[PDB]
């Protein structure tokens, strides 16, 4: 059997939400537009060692600010990704606002925080400065949508939390759009270590 989860993707306009979700090619070709809510729902299939899992990712069509999404957006949300731009400190300042707006309607759902555009070397929100929490239902990852860097990480963590299986794995990567930029390997190694020590 295949399981299905509604995933709300929220964050300030211009942080890369649409660019990120569109990396999953099949989810883009099968996306569904919801006219009454101004949303594109991308059905993202991931193939795990226990079967297929589908994340129905809700990506807004507009530039809504926190608290500006129609109420139907959050209805029956079972997980979420909050995205910001590591080159724009204001988009990270608004992460607690999106988190507050989300938890007001959905309460306790697993949430992943994603700092996008880490391919840009002039990073303003540094890994060391990422505010980390004691919450078991919150996790952070660096991502670069245009390089597919860490694309699968948020979905794998959410899948493990939703299924309750810490050893869940993806047996194959989904078909992704070819990278448009290069993620510097030295930066990736340094960022990954900086986040390890900060989380612990």
């Amino acid at each position: 059997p295949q399981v299905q989860f509604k995933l709300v993707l929220v964050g300030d306009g211009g942080t890369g939400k649409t660019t990120f979700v569109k990396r999953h090619l099949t989810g883009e070709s099968e996306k569904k537009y919801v006219a009454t809510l101004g949303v594109e729902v991308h059905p993202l299939v991931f193939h795990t060692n226990r079967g297929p899992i589908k994340f129905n990712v809700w990506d807004t069509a507009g530039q809504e600010k926190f608290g500006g999404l129609r109420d139907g957006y959050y209805i029956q949300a079972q997980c979420a990704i909050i995205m910001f731009d590591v080159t724009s400190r204001v988009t990270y300042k608004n992460v607690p606002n999106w988190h507050r707006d989300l938890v007001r309607v959905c309460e306790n759902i697993p949430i992943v925080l994603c700092g996008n555009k880490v391919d840009i070397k002039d990073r303003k929100v540094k890994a060391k400065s990422i505010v980390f929490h004691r919450k078991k239902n919150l996790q952070y990852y660096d991502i670069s949508a245009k390089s597919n860097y860490n694309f699968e990480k948020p979905f794998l963590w959410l899948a493990r939390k939703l299924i309750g299986d810490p050893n869940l794995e993806f047996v194959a990567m989904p078909a992704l759009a070819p990278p448009e930029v290069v993620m510097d390997p030295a930066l990736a190694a340094q960022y990954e270590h900086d986040l390890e020590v900060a989380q612990t």
Binding site: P1, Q4, F5, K6, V34, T36, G51, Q76
Partner: protein, 38 residues
């Protein structure tokens, strides 16, 4: 082992063909997008 029907559709529920949200049997329109039940 599979997912063991942990998240299977309950009796009478239906998935909205417009936005894929899962609805109850008595709902005549989707609780999220308000589109009438297929």
């Amino acid at each position: 082992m599979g997912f063991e029907g942990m998240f299977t559709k309950k009796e009478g529920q239906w998935d909205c063909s417009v936005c894929l949200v899962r609805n109850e049997a008595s709902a005549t329109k989707c609780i999220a997008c308000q589109c009438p039940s297929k």
